[PDB]
């Protein structure tokens, strides 16, 4: 079925809060119809299928997320299901045109290695960039704390998008690093391929 927006995370010193928008039954029904008439807000949508849930981050008018979560699915939308605009499997990256009410981040251009990861619980945590697509979590947390956060954003100090969260690098259930899809992969995708 379609990917469905089931809530959102709204970003503010970077802070975040979350709001629910859909229940489980409506999530299921909307998945089958592909028709979502709800108002959209915020930079980050909580999204779900009938089987799994994760995050999507809007950067420059596109809502991006992970292929391992969204596969090839449409996004439920006010005029019916929205076909993916970009589908990059090797990069594990898909995007739909942002629903109109959604608020876009703009890509980071400052090059800071001081990042923040916004989690599915709307907690904002410090990450130090170590390369194109990895950052260490400066305060290691159980991997459970990061469950549901796939597709959420990494931000620089100025609140611009650095990337989207892909997987945790863990030893013994403790997340010490994250793996992320760089914002450069999004621009390479929009070129491009």
């Amino acid at each position: 079925g379609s990917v469905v927006i089931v809530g959102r995370i709204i970003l503010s010193p970077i802070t975040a809060y979350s709001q629910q928008t859909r229940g489980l039954l409506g999530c299921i029904i909307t998945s089958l119809t592909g028709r979502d008439r709800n108002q959209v807000e915020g930079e980050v949508q909580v999204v779900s299928t009938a089987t799994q849930s994760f995050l999507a981050t809007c950067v420059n008018g596109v809502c991006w997320t992970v292929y391992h979560g969204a596969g090839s699915k449409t996004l439920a939308g006010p005029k019916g299901p929205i076909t993916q605009m970009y589908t990059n499997v090797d990069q594990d990256l898909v995007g739909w045109q942002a629903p109109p009410g959604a608020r876009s981040l703009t890509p980071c251009t400052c090059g800071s290695s001081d990042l923040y990861l916004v989690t599915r619980h709307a907690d904002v945590i410090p990450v130090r960039r170590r390369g194109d697509s990895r950052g260490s979590l400066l305060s290691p947390r159980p991997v459970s704390y990061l469950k549901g956060s796939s597709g959420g954003p990494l931000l620089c100090p100025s609140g611009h998008a650095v990337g989207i969260f892909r997987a945790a690098v863990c030893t013994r259930g403790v997340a010490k690093a994250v793996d992320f899809v760089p914002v450069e992969s999004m621009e390479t995708t929009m070129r491009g391929s």
Binding site: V6, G7, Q20, T21, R22, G23, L24, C27, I28, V46, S48, T49, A50, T51, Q52, S53, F54, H68, G69, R120, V143, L146, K147, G148, S149, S150, F165, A167, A168, V169, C170, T171, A175, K176, A177, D179
Partner: peptide, 17 residues
Amino acid sequence: GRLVYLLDGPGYDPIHC
């Protein structure tokens, strides 16, 4: 350490048992 993927169950706040 190993890569761990982080999908959760269906819905805004997925039910765990």
